[PDB]
Design a protein around this nucleic acid. Structure first.
Ligand SMILES: Nc1nc2c(ncn2[C@@H]2O[C@H](COP(=O)(O)OP(=O)(O)NP(=O)(O)O)[C@@H](O)[C@H]2O)c(=O)[nH]1
Ligand SMILES: Nc1nc2c(ncn2[C@@H]2O[C@H](COP(=O)(O)OP(=O)(O)NP(=O)(O)O)[C@@H](O)[C@H]2O)c(=O)[nH]1
Lengths: 178, 411
RNA sequence: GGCACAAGGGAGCUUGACUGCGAGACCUACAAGUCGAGCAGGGACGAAAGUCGGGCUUAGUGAUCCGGUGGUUCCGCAUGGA
RNA sequence: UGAUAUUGAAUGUUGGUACAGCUUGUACAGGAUAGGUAGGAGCCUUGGAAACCGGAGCGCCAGCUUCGGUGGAGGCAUCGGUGGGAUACUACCCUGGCUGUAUUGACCUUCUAACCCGCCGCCCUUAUCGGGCGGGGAGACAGUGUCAGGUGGGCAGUU
RNA sequence: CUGGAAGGUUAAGAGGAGCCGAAUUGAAGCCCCAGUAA
């Protein structure tokens, strides 16, 4: 019945366990025009990112920490197989070509789309930062200390609010479930 | 022949596309509420191929959506429009749920992309798990070639109209005629929005009935270009030759509604509805019979018919009435016989400074029309013109149709 | 008003049957309105130079105040955006 | 010709809201055949966990959801993938209900105080005006101020 | 014009088998009841 505080819930989701502390947030479609879906680099913070870099952009992609780049087309290797691993990003030139292949990325949630900051010319800066109207966000672990998830939820809430959606009218906040 | 249908959500350029395929009958505005409210048919042409097209809609929402499901099944291939600018919405999956259980072919389309730079952002549209999206634009004719082929891949008389004022029962009238649920009926005025085609055969004879959603007072039409729908009624009148008028068992606008039809040179028939509502006993019909005769005198040839949609009485007599008006509206006469009687009229009325009559002949057969060769075109009097009119309408039938009369000079 | 050097026929694909653009006839009231000089960009059997079409004018009513939809290195009323 | 303030008091008839609590989504899987967000970090236990037998809702009329004492420390086994899934949820939420909680709305009786009287008495007063007290009758409608359907022959404009 | 459903038809069809049309459904209208004559 009682709404706890932020300084209490970080110390208490220690006790709700090495598990991962995640946050749900009910948003306030009618408002799809100014919907609230997104990604931001995190403060208090293993992935396997595979890139689709084209041209010279592969040359800076092999030194940042990526596992496999490609031989400029391995979607034929993606056809009939392809246990995908963690994250797929791309570049704004071959995205259309990969896209015209079908929904091998539709119901699997890895389709490159430049609304998320994942399809850009800065592939070296993109590898290094990734490593019904609702958003899910993993802010961290159980084993993090009490001062880590406070900055993590603060950064994510300031990101949500920094993004005060248009048609701001009416309540924006409905629920925080830590 | 193959039948194609388009479904979707409010604001997806559907009616717009359908119009761009062929014609502009479909009403187009910019707002959430104003959408095509029911099925409508047409014809198309794409190579040897010649399929049709079914247009659907996005208060009362259950009915139209149900009507859309009716279309859904009896269709051959499915066109599923969706917007491109704002990505994926809740309503998209909502409709996708029924599409998944709809064991029919699906071709997806993406609108609102009218420039090359906007052609992208299609990868995101891979959720449906359907085939390849093909962008299209409404303002411009972009990307339609790929779409049509996408459809062609799976691809293997008289007309009369009914008009009136809103909230009279005109929609109930039609559906009952066919005996089929075809158009939406509601107790609120102006439920229907735009004209709907319906083709059917009666007694080895095919017919085409049309609705016009009723019309309010001419000063009473102040809305978000709902005149844009009113004009569609006007075009419909031009399309067909016979008009039936429906009054509920009299207001001057009903006379004004009959105004456009009479001047149009189109046969017009008087019909009443809801006869069950009023008292129904001996000699009741006379009161209305002379009231309409007294009110309406600039028309006389219109026969009077009685029907009640709810109880479905006398509805059989309505159709035949229409056929009789047809040939009357398309009938020529022997010029010898016509001029044979013109003089008898002048013999009995030798008081036309004096007009002279020499000749009269039928020229326009589409609508009973003729021309008289007199000495002085100015010397006439409209009453005398009204005199020669009745005489001819009494020599022969010419009933249920108007007559236009012309008077050329001697020359 | 043509005598084939403008009614046959492989290829040359093919409505440049185009995007830029301009000296004279007109009617000469002009506006308007029309018809045909002259030229960069490859764009052709093309090789020597031939290309703005169905070889008499005969049309898609007036093509417009017909914009309400769209690209904007143009303005934006105190400074940013709208 | 319909809304809204005058316009108030109690009955039942209901509604609409929100707040809790309980319950709901059988699907082409998975001990059957369930909506948008993590592959565990098992439970011993309990109308049966194997079989075992009530109860609806029901049913997708299949076969489930738990209230759940026999066998019972036995049992399925978190665990995998004939459908795009796959547990122990951090769990949020919707959907469809039920329960009660409260805040209103509306109809039925309606009572009187409102608001009314071209009703009868007394006084101002010598007065068929007017006014003040009494009774009486109708009583929350009426009428009264602002918003929407005919309708003016009443007023214009007009070629 | 008035009821009371009985007598069937169901009507173009909606549907269609063989070969243009099987079966099978299908409002009215025909008193199929008189009173009525406006
Ligand atoms: N910018 C832009 N606007 C478009 C395009 N196509 C349609 N629209 C706009 O979208 C509006 C909605 O289209 P409309 O056909 O009226 O939709 P509807 O009649 O409601 N039927 P539906 O909602 O199912 O599509 C149109 O009036 C037009 O202004 C397009 O390609 N680009
Ligand atoms: N009693 C009775 N009611 C009727 C009759 N015909 C129609 N109605 C009713 O009158 C209303 C009018 O419906 P509808 O057919 O939409 O009339 P409309 O509005 O004039 N047609 P539209 O919707 O195209 O404008 C409906 O409630 C219908 O049930 C009739 O003969 N008798």
């Amino acid at each position: 019945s009682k709404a706890y505080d932020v300084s209490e819930a970080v110390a208490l989701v220690k006790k709700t366990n090495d598990a991962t502390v995640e946050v749900a947030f009910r948003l306030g479609p009618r408002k799809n025009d100014q919907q609230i879906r997104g990604a931001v680099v995190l403060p208090n913070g293993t992935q396997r990112v595979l890139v689709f870099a084209k041209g010279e952009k592969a040359k800076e992609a092999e030194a940042a920490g990526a596992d496999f780049v490609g031989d400029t087309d391995y979607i034929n290797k993606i056809q009939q197989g392809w246990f995908d691993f963690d994250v797929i990003v791309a570049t704004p030139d071959m995205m259309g070509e990969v896209g015209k292949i079908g929904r091998v990325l539709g119901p699997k949630g890895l389709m490159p789309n430049p609304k998320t900051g994942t399809v850009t010319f800065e592939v070296e800066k993109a590898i290094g930062e990734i490593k019904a109207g609702n958003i899910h966000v993993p802010i961290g672990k159980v084993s993090f200390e009490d001062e880590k998830l406070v900055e993590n939820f603060t950064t994510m809430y300031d990101t949500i609010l920094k993004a005060k959606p248009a048609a701001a009218k009416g309540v924006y906040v409905k629920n925080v479930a830590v | 022949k193959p039948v194609v249908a388009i479904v979707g959500r409010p604001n997806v350029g559907k009616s717009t596309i359908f119009n761009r395929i062929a014609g502009e009958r479909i009403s187009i505005v910019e707002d959430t509420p104003g959408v095509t409210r029911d099925r409508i048919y047409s014809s198309a042409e794409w190579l040897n191929y010649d399929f049709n097209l079914i247009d659907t809609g996005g208060p009362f929402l259950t009915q139209i959506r149900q009507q859309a499901e009716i279309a859904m099944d009896e269709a051959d291939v499915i066109i599923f429009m969706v917007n491109g600018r704002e990505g994926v919405t809740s309503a998209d999956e909502e409709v996708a749920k029924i599409l998944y259980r709809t064991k029919k072919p699906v071709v997806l389309a993406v609108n609102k992309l009218d420039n090359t730079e906007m052609r992208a952002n299609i990868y995101d549209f891979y959720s449906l798990g359907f085939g390849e999206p093909y962008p299209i634009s409404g303002t411009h004719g972009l990307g339609l070639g790929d779409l049509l082929d996408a459809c062609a891949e799976h691809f293997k008389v008289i007309q009369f109209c009914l008009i009136g004022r809103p909230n009279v029962g005109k929609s109930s009238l039609v559906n009952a005629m066919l005996g089929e649920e075809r158009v939406i009926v509601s107790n609120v005025a102006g439920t229907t929005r735009d004209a709907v085609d319906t083709a059917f055969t009666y007694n080895q004879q095919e017919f085409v009935i049309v609705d016009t959603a009723g019309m309010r007072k001419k000063g009473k039409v102040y809305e978000t270009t709902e005149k844009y729908s009113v004009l569609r009624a006007l075009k419909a009148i031009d399309r067909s030759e016979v008009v039936g008028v429906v009054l509920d068992g009299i207001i001057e606008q009903d006379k004004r509604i009959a105004g456009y039809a009479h001047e149009a040179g189109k046969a017009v028939v008087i019909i009443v509805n809801k006869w069950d509502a009023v008292d129904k006993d001996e000699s009741t019909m006379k009161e209305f019979e002379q009231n309409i005769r007294e009110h309406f005198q600039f028309l006389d040839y219109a026969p009077v018919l009685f029907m009640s949609a709810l109880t479905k009485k006398r509805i059989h007599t309505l159709m035949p009435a229409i056929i009789k008006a047809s040939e009357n509206h398309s009938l020529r006469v022997q010029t010898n016989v016509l001029n044979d009687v013109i003089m008898d009229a002048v013999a009995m009325n030798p008081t036309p400074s004096r007009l002279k009559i020499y000749y009269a002949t039928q020229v326009s057969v589409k609508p009973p029309s003729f021309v008289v060769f007199v000495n002085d075109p100015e010397l006439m009097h409209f009453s005398y013109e009204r005199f020669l009119e009745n005489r001819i309408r009494d020599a022969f039938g010419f009933e249920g149709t108007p007559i236009k009369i012309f008077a050329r000079a001697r020359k």
